[PDB]
């Protein structure tokens, strides 16, 4: 059935013209079917015949429904879609379960073939020209065509208008459109709810939009991209891991993919040894001998995934609480809840060390990421429970070179606490050895020397094969740190070292930097100073 | 009224910037504000057939507890054609200036039909449970560059009387704001401002006090190897600005593997060299002149303890102005607050002085900034910015700025 709604003006992108592709030759059976089917929607007014005044054409296909029984049709709009204008956002984001609120009842109204109910822009219609050839009849769409770029866009806005009055009339009823499904929830008593649904159904019917009756309507639980939605709680469908005897590269990858998704809900899941089987993989279908370490790991993961998890929905009248935990260097797990242990959402992040960072900086980044997803989901920011002392945060941020911040938070004594691994002295140490370190290397030959000399007479130097200047400088610093006692003063002219003085990183991409880092941590008191190069010093 | 045809620069297309997530609190504020404007015919709902978009958000000014809608037309403005438009070099000398929000005036004037599409903006929804509410302007939009331009005529008329009867007062219009400066003492100034308000209805700053501060060098009774080392480093780098600065005589004292704590007596030669350097530092470098055809740039450096330093320049080391900034009372626990405030004051000065907004180089991670800048913004305009890594040397230098 067609509807009396204002068509949305659709034009082809500036400078382009309608489709003109060839029509495939078909079997008499594929033709018979298309003739019959097309005559059907023809009588319905969905499609109208056209003459030679239309030079456009789209390829029509015929595919039997699941397993060669009755015949169905398909139109390949690929080209037309390329020439059609762009519309605004189709779905600017999906509602995450943790952002929903509980309802006494929810019903989904499949407005199925409503696409063919909304009238297309009359002018544009011509571009939808297609043909049913003989073995040895032209048509065009008068309504939104299945597969056409603009259909979903137009269809959505249409439903929006049509529903505007019903929503106003019923501000206690929640509707949510997704594709051709209409999710409607409420907190009314079942009988009342049933009534309003019908009223809605009739309101839609008033615009030709046919919808199924109670006898043919779907109901909860609702499978929503991973979650199993219930009117009072959402559930995570326990993930199944196939116990194979022979594994291929491809298989391992897909496995790790599913496992990595799981880790958000089930922290504890590990894939280190499983990822290790990919090293040097020559082909996607090559078989890999599962290392016992991987067997133990894969097994432990199945136990974890045995216990299904279910949580609660958002309660607007309650505060939001976000707690974070560091599982390892650069790994943080967080869970957001309103009532302790009654989780809304959980998650984790893996931070590739990158250039040079420190745990507090990483904590900061977690806090940041969380704050953002919260705003998108709940429209507000959580109060944070962070495994770090107010003293530590204060010391670090007040002197850090970059602007940084953490919203209202509260320390939670849940080990392991994140702390400052070391802190360079602000002024030279009295009664401490002074190492004047320096390193240089021939850029081209990759050959260098790293060394130092102390005010206490101590000296050293090393020749380095296959090194770079930046490395040499750092190596010098490493040596000074190795041969020095608990207290050390080190002067260098390395501009790169200036980075450490400022950022004081406790993790880096460079293994060498890390060596220095470990040494710095071991020291009681270190004072690092920089002096300009090629001068008197 | 009859509308002037506005167009995009040739070959350009409308902005298609995505909306940032907004808090419940401000989504509400916007919906309310927009339903009202819609009734008043300022804006209209649009369909998906319009693909353009521009970010929107709400802020409350200090001394204001009522939400005010703000749009990010930066992208559009950049694509909107240029169009006579003055800047009084005397406003920079006034004893006092007052900023005025004349944004409302624009809503009276209609916007050319064909350009309206390009002003599309979207009110989002919490958890995407509802489609975005799409609107577009029908009248002149606040924060757009074309608006002050087209309203120019009407504006000059309205002001001419106050102008002719008070040629001793300077009035400058930069977008939604009007800067009124006078040398008249606070009494007459404030009263004359209130009068000017009424004049408009019917239809505190201090400009040169912003004196560039010199770089002061430390003074000790006795200097240590470390002290000298720090000093020499500062100067060596500083020679990029003042080439007359020498550091050899001092560097000479630094020869030898001495302990950093070792006390060193200055040679009469070194003493001179230093005294001479202080002299050169007593005043800003010669040869720096503003070029209206080049972009203005502002660098900011977190100095800790609530202090921040900045430099406005067009070419590196050739600074037009430099200054320090102490955090406002209230932001005692957060940088983002202090930074935005700083950004705002600096942009203002740039306006007063050159009538142009500086491109900022901010010492902050993009994410941190994007997430919270709106929460503290209180200006009708939005300047350009990029995120950078503060070089240790440039920081140590400006740290040495003179104070009262
Ligand atoms: C996202 C989605 C599939 C919603 C329908 O399923 C549920 C939704 C809710 N709660 C809300 S607030 C709702 C219901 C219809 O539309 C909305 C926005 C609760 C339980 C289920 Cl099972």
Swiss-Prot record, chain B:
Changing residue 289 to F: Confers resistance to delavirdine and nevirapine. The record marks 372, 385 as: Essential for RT p66/p51 heterodimerization. Changing residue 129 to K: Confers resistance to emivirine. Changing residue 73 to L: Confers multi-NRTI resistance. Changing residue 172 to C: Confers multi-NNRTI resistance. Changing residue 94 to E: Confers resistance to atevirdine. A motif (Tryptophan repeat motif) lies at residues 369-385. Changing residue 65 to N: Confers resistance to lamivudine and stavudine. This is p51 RT. It comes from Human immunodeficiency virus type 1 group M subtype B (isolate HXB2) (HIV-1).
């Amino acid at each position: 059935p067609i509807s009396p709604i204002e068509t949305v003006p659709v034009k082809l992108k500036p400078g382009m013209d309608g489709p003109k592709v060839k029509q495939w030759p078909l079997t008499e059976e594929k033709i018979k079917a298309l003739v019959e089917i097309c005559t059907e929607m023809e009588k319905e007014g969905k499609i109208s015949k056209i003459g030679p005044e239309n030079p456009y054409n789209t390829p029509v296909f015929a595919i039997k429904k699941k397993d060669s029984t009755k015949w169905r049709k398909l139109v390949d709009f690929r080209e037309l879609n390329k020439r059609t204008q762009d519309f605004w956002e189709v779905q600017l984001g999906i509602p995450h379960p943790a952002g929903l609120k509980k309802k006494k009842s929810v019903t989904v109204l499949d407005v199925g073939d409503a696409y063919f109910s909304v009238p297309l822009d009359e002018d544009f219609r011509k571009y939808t020209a297609f043909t049913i050839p003989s073995i040895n009849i032209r048509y065009q769409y008068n309504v939104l065509p299945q597969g056409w770029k603009g259909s979903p866009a137009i269809f959505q806005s249409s439903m929006t208008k049509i529903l505007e009055p019903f929503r106003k009339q019923n501000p206690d009823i929640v509707i949510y459109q997704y594709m051709d499904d209409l999710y409607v929830g409420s907190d009314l008593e079942i009988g009342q709810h049933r009534t309003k649904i019908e009223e809605l159904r009739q309101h839609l019917l008033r615009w030709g939009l046919t919808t199924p009756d109670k006898k043919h309507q779907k109901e909860p639980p609702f499978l929503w991209m991973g979650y199993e939605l219930h009117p009072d709680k959402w559930t995570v469908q326990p993930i199944v891991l196939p116990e194979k005897d022979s594994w291929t590269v491809n298989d391992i990858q897909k496995l790790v993919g599913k496992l990595n998704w799981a880790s958000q809900i089930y922290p504890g899941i590990k894939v280190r040894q499983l990822c290790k089987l990919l090293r040097g993989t020559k082909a996607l279908t090559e078989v890999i001998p599962l290392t016992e370490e991987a067997e133990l790991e894969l097994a432990e993961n199945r136990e974890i995934l045995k216990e299904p998890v279910h949580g609660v929905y958002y309660d607007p009248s309650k505060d939001l609480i976000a707690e974070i935990q560091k599982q390892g260097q650069g790994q943080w797990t967080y869970q957001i809840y309103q009532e302790p242990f009654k989780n809304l959402k959980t998650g984790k992040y893996a931070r590739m060390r990158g250039a040079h960072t420190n745990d507090v900086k990483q904590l900061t980044e977690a806090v940041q990421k969380i704050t953002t997803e919260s705003i998108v989901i709940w429209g507000k920011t959580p109060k944070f429970k962070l495994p770090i002392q107010k003293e530590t945060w204060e010391t670090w941020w007040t002197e850090y070179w970059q602007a940084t911040w953490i919203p209202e938070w509260e320390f939670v004594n849940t080990p392991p606490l994140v702390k400052l691994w070391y802190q360079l002295e602000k002024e030279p140490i009295v009664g401490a050895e002074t190492f004047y370190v320096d390193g240089a290397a021939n850029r081209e030959t990759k050959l260098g020397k790293a060394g130092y000399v102390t005010n206490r007479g101590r000296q050293k130097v090393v020749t380095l094969t296959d090194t770079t200047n930046q490395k040499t400088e750092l190596q010098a610093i490493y040596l000074a740190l190795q041969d020095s006692g608990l207290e050390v003063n080190i002067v260098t002219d390395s501009q790169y070292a200036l980075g450490i003085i400022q950022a004081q990183p406790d993790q880096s991409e460079s293994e060498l930097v890390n060596q220095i880092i470990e040494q710095l941590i071991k020291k009681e008191k270190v004072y690092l100073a920089w002096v300009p190069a090629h001068k008197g010093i | 009224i009859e509308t002037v045809p506005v167009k995009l620069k040739p070959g350009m297309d409308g902005p298609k910037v995505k909306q940032w997530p907004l808090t419940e609190e401000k989504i509400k504020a916007l919906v309310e504000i927009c339903t009202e404007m819609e009734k008043e015919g300022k804006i209209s709902k649009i369909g998906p057939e319009n693909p353009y978009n521009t970010p929107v958000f709400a802020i409350k000014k200090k001394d204001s507890t009522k939400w005010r809608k703000l749009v990010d037309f930066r992208e559009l403005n950049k694509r909107t054609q240029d169009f006579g438009i003055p800047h009084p070099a005397g406003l920079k000398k006034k004893k006092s200036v007052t900023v005025l929000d004349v944004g409302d005036a624009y809503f009276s004037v209609p916007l050319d039909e064909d350009f309206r599409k390009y002003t599309a903006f979207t009110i989002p929804s919490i958890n995407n449970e509802t489609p975005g509410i799409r609107y577009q302007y029908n009248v002149l939009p606040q924060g757009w560059k074309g608006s002050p331009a087209i309203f120019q005529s009407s504006m000059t008329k309205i002001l001419e009387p106050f102008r002719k009867q008070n040629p001793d007062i300077v009035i400058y219009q930069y977008m939604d704001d009007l800067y009124v400066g006078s040398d008249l003492e606070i009494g007459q100034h404030r009263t004359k401002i209130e009068e000017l308000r009424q004049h408009l209805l019917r239809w505190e700053l201090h400009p040169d006090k912003w004196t560039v501060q010199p770089i002061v060098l430390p003074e000790k009774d006795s200097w240590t190897v470390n002290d000298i080392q720090k000093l020499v480093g500062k100067l060596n780098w500083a020679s990029q600005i003042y080439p007359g600065i020498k550091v050899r005589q001092l560097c000479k004292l630094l020869r030898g593997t001495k302990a950093l704590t070792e006390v060193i007596p200055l040679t009469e030669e070194a003493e001179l060299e230093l005294a001479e350097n202080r002299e050169i530092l007593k005043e800003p470098v010669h040869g720096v002149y503003y070029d209206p055809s080049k972009d203005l740039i502002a660098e900011i450096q977190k100095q800790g303890q609530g202090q921040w330093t900045y430099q406005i320049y067009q070419e590196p080391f050739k600074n037009l102005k430099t200054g320090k900034y102490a955090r406002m009372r209230g932001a005692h626990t957060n940088d983002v607050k202090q930074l935005t405030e700083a950004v705002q004051k600096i942009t203002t000065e740039s306006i007063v002085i050159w009538g142009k907004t500086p491109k900022f180089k901010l010492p902050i991670q993009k994410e941190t900034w994007e997430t919270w800048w709106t929460e503290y913004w209180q200006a009708t305009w939005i300047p350009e910015w990029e995120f950078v890594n503060t070089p240790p040397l440039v920081k140590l230098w400006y740290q040495l700025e003179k104070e009262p």
